Amino acid sequence: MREIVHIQAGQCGNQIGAKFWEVISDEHGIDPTGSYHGDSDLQLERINVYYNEATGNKYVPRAILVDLEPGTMDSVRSGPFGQIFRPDNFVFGQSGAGNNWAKGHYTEGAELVDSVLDVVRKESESCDCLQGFQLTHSLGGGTGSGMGTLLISKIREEYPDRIMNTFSVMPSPKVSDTVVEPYNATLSVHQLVENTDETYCIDNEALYDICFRTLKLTTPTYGDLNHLVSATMSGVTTCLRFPGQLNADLRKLAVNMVPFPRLHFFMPGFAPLTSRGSQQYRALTVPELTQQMFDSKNMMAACDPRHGRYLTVAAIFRGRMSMKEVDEQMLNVQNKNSSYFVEWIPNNVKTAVCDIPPRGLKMSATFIGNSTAIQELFKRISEQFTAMFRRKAFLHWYTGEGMDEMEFTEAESNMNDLVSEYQQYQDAT
Amino acid sequence: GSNSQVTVAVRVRPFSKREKTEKASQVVFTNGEEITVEHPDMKQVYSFIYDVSFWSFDECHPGYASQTTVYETLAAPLLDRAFEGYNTCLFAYGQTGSGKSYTMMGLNEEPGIIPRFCEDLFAQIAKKQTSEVSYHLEMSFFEVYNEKIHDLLVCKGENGQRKQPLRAREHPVSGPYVEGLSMNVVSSYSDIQSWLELGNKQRATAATGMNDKSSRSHSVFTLVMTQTKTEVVEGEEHDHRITSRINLVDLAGSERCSTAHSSGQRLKEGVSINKSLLTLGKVISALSEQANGKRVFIPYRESTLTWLLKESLGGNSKTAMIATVSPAASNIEETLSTLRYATQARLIVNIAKVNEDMNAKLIRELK
Amino acid sequence: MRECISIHVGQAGVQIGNACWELYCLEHGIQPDGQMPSDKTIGGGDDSFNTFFSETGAGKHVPRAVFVDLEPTVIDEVRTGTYRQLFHPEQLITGKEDAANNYARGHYTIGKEIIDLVLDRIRKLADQCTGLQGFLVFHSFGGGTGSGFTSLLMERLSVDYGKKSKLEFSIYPAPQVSTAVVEPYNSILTTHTTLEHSDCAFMVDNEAIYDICRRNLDIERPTYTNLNRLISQIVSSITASLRFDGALNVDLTEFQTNLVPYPRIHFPLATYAPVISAEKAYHEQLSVAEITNACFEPANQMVKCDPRHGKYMACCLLYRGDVVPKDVNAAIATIKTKRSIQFVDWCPTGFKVGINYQPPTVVPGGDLAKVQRAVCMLSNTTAIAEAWARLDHKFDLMYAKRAFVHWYVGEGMEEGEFSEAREDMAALEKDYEEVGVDSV
């Protein structure tokens, strides 16, 4: 009765989503053919959230994979968990976006989006009571950005009273991976700010720092980075699937976290993370999780909270716990580090505790934070944007596909105006 | 340009059939020009001051403020400034059944600010229609419905799904505007009347508990007045050009979802109206705090109404507002909220200037 | 499936074609007789990846390529050589004379009577493609066929096809070394015509590879069978994303965007860092950090142009093999900390990354070693103006006396087509100057 439609766009989302379903299945006990080989009953009590049912007691995911290059869709089908997807939900084309936002939005994505949405209406109208949507895409490219934000804009008009919980990888500060990350990110934020309800910002630079500093991993691959994001995508939606003393759906987070409708860009986290040796020297308890979660080195956003203020944060705990330990520790943070919290919000924290942990952990905890630090992900793009736009650096690849300079300017002012809304609360009062 | 404040006015409408049937006590009183409110709790009597107060409650008392009076007190000065070249804005505010779709447009027998302003403008122009200054008028008439824009002067096609929506876009200099708006040329008051009639026939209205014909869509009536002045110059003449914009706004009402009992589409549009008005209140409070020297950001972008009226609430225009209130006890809370927003709108100022439109040609530089 | 067409023109391209297809056939597992026993033992597959090899019913795999010339004496080493049973016998080779180092002879005179036959066999290969990615043209400035015919062909393709990426891999004329006294004329007329049609023309200079083969591989007496295997590795490192699985795969359209800011400055340079002999293949770590910095080392540039006399506008890196991304971001950070590498202020990102999992192979009989990692750096630098000017000055010296002009007019060419072309060459040198100037 609380269902989630999962869309994947581009190379980053699909290689995450393939790892996301390789995590949820291991939780609910589904195997790479869709069959059930679990131990407990709770794994199936609420399997209807992500997975549907099928004939021979199999379970098919509500997964809609989108792309414009078949090369990656095939990489998913040949993987371990590629066989459970619905082949009629592998929607793709040819003539890839070329890391051009316009191609994914206007020219090649326009000729494919109607085939994507007709699949969504099937999966959606087969739901008893829909909660919201869920997208995994990467800003900086064309497919995830143009064809991604397009579907968002079309889905809100068709399903406006539901949540569009977008998971989105933002560009990095130091080392780019596409030269025109700034052009594409400014335009996507112009769309996300107006057509989403909660957007989790992830930066790959901080994922590497998590893996190299804390986990003490030497050779981390992309299959390891996405092993962290999947863990966060799963904690936001645990108190739907499993029971607990104090539950919280997606909507409950958006209320307590978004005080003004534009400031829905969040800084996530996950606890506890340790090396393959150091776990013998720690002890798991609510305090040891709370410390990691409010530590700047644990955030996935590459943006230090201590250069800003927390407006309102969330902590979705999982495991047998005392609520006093939870309520008291979230209080101690506020009274100790009050300068990094807002004065005109009395309590800046909510809670949610599930009673069913992760496959092999006595307890776990997820962090979600709305912070005035998040300017820094936006001033960089804007300054990168104006230095390139002021001389029309790579622009004829965007004008020649049905755009004008007016649209690049709008996307700058909306990004700059989102910056100022965060600035006016950064300073004391 | 120089600082100029927003002219705030108030109007107390008379009892309606509903307040008479469910007999309620008069609570709003005018202490000469102040507007006082005597709460049934009788803890205190509030008193609010305004630049102007209108008492159209009675039909006998000295102080009766009729439609021509409201015009000659509020709208004619804006016509003076428009002829001076300034942009002007006027917008209504209030709760459901307060008389916002009456003060501005009026009935066929008691016309409002819109027809009086258009007629007076055209007549003054005809009077001043000398060979020196050639005048041109264009108009538009659009609305806002569930956060979507619609053009009222565009006849719907042969279908029901004909409310073809437009979108807003930011020109980097002229500010926000509507893409695809069928601006129409204006010769005279008769053509203005015809266009306006077609528009109001197309506008979204409906019946409810607290009104038989209530507006479920915000309405903006825009005039663009261009004066091309002749002058003796040694070269080509007719460079002196003044373009001024007049923007008249009829907003929708608060509407609690209990009195005006509704379900479905009525409720949905009732929610959207409510959200737009919330954002408007936030904008007004933010501009008031700007007037006191603090650092504030104005949430223009949180709604299409404020987005398309950005340059008028603050910005560059001689702005005014007309608050509308009922005199009964059942609407005391909405009356007080409206009056508070009205009085804290008075502290707003905006930098209005003459729109010479000669920057970097010769004349603004010579200035 | 995604596909690319490989057009080969003139002696300089054909001899590179033999080197590229020797490599493609080895990597996927094809014998010279078109067969792939791997699918006979496995039971079928797309290992004979359809980007470059089309398949028939008898198991034969034919390459998607066309091998144009005007000499018979070059192709007839193919029709009689090891790979005769691989290529379609339609090789489109003219039973007439050559162009004799003449643009006018290859462009119009003996470029017609051939072009229509070349443009059809290209049409046949394109109608067999379910989504075409682009072209790959192999020619050399200096000749008539690599200058003329390539300027004739790229004009026709911009008409019929238009939107497909049309890339060039060109042998830039060297400053000191040269095999013709009329290379500059044939080179400056070419850029006048291709500059409006091609989208990215990678350039190589034979002189730099001669030096690269001396310092690193220790080959004092090289031939053209050594330069071209090293060019074949550049093309493979580009086209690997279309053939093999990887983490970040860079298609053709992405080179065309990241590296080409303005339409007229699409003249980047290529290189390949781990040029290491078998002996020096040991004693080396060959990490991402060691391989990546070498791509910026001027000695290992494949064009004789000091990048330190200019600025980088864009740079695309194509890693291969056991390459982890964290090692790459450490490298690209280390390069932006230096000061001998000065970027433009309007490209604060500057970089692009591509990573594949299929390591490079070793063509037997060769010189390169079995390395587990490899890099191909494609850079857009403002330094290449110094090479354009050096060629223009050679052009203005011998054109003032109208030397060697009557051989061009005698084939159909107006005197003003030099001057017009010269003006075009004198513009581009200002564009590379303007864009490299720091903004206010």
Ligand SMILES: CC(=O)O[C@H]1C(=O)[C@@]2(C)[C@H]([C@H](OC(=O)c3ccccc3)[C@]3(O)C[C@H](OC(=O)[C@H](O)[C@@H](NC(=O)c4ccccc4)c4ccccc4)C(C)=C1C3(C)C)[C@]1(OC(C)=O)CO[C@@H]1C[C@@H]2O
């Ligand atoms: C019993 C034990 O000691 O093994 C642990 C373990 O030692 C540690 C190192 C694990 C381990 O961490 C990693 O190996 C890792 C590598 C790259 C990126 C992220 C993690 C572990 O691999 C990770 C793995 O995590 C889980 O099992 C959770 O169920 C996790 N799901 C999966 O790992 C999973 C992924 C794909 C397929 C099947 C299962 C999960 C996370 C969120 C929500 C639900 C489930 C677990 C328990 C462990 C190992 C195996 C060592 C930790 O990992 C996580 C994210 O929980 C690191 O800290 C936790 C717990 C332990 O410290």
Ligand SMILES: Nc1nc2c(ncn2[C@@H]2O[C@H](COP(=O)(O)OP(=O)(O)OP(=O)(O)O)[C@@H](O)[C@H]2O)c(=O)[nH]1
């Ligand atoms: N790198 C490389 N360059 C070659 C090779 N063969 C010829 N060239 C170059 O070709 C240039 C001379 O022009 P050609 O390529 O022979 O002219 P063409 O395109 O063959 O046209 P024609 O000479 O009329 O047949 C010189 O710069 C040579 O370096 C080769 O095998 N490898």
Ligand SMILES: Nc1ncnc2c1ncn2[C@@H]1O[C@H](COP(=O)(O)OP(=O)(O)NP(=O)(O)O)[C@@H](O)[C@H]1O
């Ligand atoms: N001064 C007045 N004298 C008499 N009747 C009045 C007066 N002002 C308003 N009314 C009555 O008010 C009724 C509705 O007014 P209306 O113009 O719809 O207010 P409103 O603000 O537009 N309601 P809404 O559409 O929700 O905004 C009409 O039927 C008029 O008879």
Ligand SMILES: Nc1nc2c(ncn2[C@@H]2O[C@H](COP(=O)(O)OP(=O)(O)O)[C@@H](O)[C@H]2O)c(=O)[nH]1
């Ligand atoms: N975390 C993560 N990021 C990825 C992965 N693959 C690609 N990316 C990111 O995607 C961005 C490039 O966008 P891309 O996915 O190519 O867009 P597309 O080509 O339109 O699909 C880069 O910033 C990469 O860091 C992955 O497996 N994991």
Ligand SMILES: [Mg+2]
């Ligand atoms: Mg009304």
Ligand SMILES: [Mg+2]
């Ligand atoms: Mg020859």
